[PDB]
Design a protein around this ligand. Structure first.
Ligand SMILES: Cc1cc(Nc2nc(Nc3ccccc3S(=O)(=O)C(C)C)c3c[nH]nc3n2)c(OC(C)C)cc1C1CCN(C)CC1
Length: 294
């Protein structure tokens, strides 16, 4: 049993809630995660997302899968997907998570784009993720991969809550201390200069990635640094280059992004300050009355 440490408490495979396999039913495929397929399922009924581990995998993949279950089960915050439990004693092995019926944020933004959503919907998504990030920061947990593709929504309609739903990068660094991948797989477009240059990671790394997420949100799901490759982005950012505001982006929202992207980590705001700034934008009629492009 590899041990896992969070908020000064240690846990192991034994502390995970094993759900009897007979109580688990798969309904439909949702796509693929890092290891294998993710399904919509039911427990005992509880609506779940079922992360599966391919039966044809290395011993390292199994340990990576166990660590993912330990990481998610130990968080306790409304803006981080809950873990119902696991099914590790039957094959293929499962991790059971809170089903997010609105899907991922990137696909939600592209699909729900006003066509022939308002500024407040976008600000609420941002605040929700900032709350989850503040919980990680206060608990000294560095996410390393804050991005729209890693955020999920409880439902498509009004009342939706955005949550952080992937901890793959953090898990990779926890086990090995380094990154499974290589340069071509690193989320370059979400990383600050000290991270891709020195391999230095702090909660100020997450501040920078949150700035990029804010751009993804207010652009309604565009890929960051339009038309630029990873190496072009690396050179651009290291030289002081920053993205322009997304189309119709209110000035106070764009200023939060530019504050998240300060070159020096000490000049970036922490998540408590980011939250205060998003809260002020939601209060500003000139911000929330700005029409989103159609
Ligand atoms: C992407 C996604 C997610 C969920 N719901 C969910 N998904 C988790 N994960 C996950 C899922 C797929 C791939 C990778 C991961 S992942 O875990 O590797 C990471 C990339 C998020 C969930 C984990 N916990 N809860 C989840 N809910 C969803 O729920 C249905 C019931 C709405 C629908 C969709 C798609 C959206 C676009 N169209 C329509 C096709 C369906």
């Amino acid at each position: 049993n590899p041990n896992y440490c969070f908020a000064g408490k240690t846990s192991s495979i034994s502390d995970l809630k094993e759900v009897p396999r007979k109580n688990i039913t798969l309904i439909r495929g949702l796509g693929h995660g890092a290891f294998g397929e993710v399904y919509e399922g039911q427990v005992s009924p509880l609506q779940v997302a079922v992360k599966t581990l391919p039966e044809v995998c290395s011993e390292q993949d199994e340990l990576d899968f166990l660590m993912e279950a330990l990481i998610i089960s130990k968080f306790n915050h409304q803006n981080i997907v809950r873990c119902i439990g696991v099914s590790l004693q039957s094959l293929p092995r499962f991790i059971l998570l809170e089903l997010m019926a609105g899907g991922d944020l990137k696909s939600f933004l592209r699909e729900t784009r006003p066509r022939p959503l308002a500024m407040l919907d976008l600000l609420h998504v941002a605040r929700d993720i900032a709350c989850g990030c503040q919980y990680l920061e206060e608990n000294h947990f560095i996410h390393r991969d804050i991005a729209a593709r890693n955020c999920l929504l409880t439902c498509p309609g009004p009342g939706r809550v955005a949550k952080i739903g992937d901890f793959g990068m953090a898990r990779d660094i926890y086990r090995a201390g380094y990154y499974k991948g290589g340069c071509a797989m690193l989320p370059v477009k979400w990383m600050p200069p000290e991270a891709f240059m020195e391999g230095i990671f702090t909660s100020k790394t997450d501040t920078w990635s949150f700035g990029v997420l804010l751009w993804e949100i207010f652009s309604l799901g565009y890929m960051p640094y339009p038309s630029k490759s990873n190496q072009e982005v690396l050179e651009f950012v290291t030289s002081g280059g920053r993205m322009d505001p997304p189309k119709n982006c209110p000035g106070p929202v764009y200023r939060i992004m530019t504050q998240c992207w300060q070159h020096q980590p000490e000049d970036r705001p922490n998540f408590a300050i980011i939250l205060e700034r998003i809260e002020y934008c939601t209060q500003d009629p000139d911000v929330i009355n700005t029409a989103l492009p159609i």
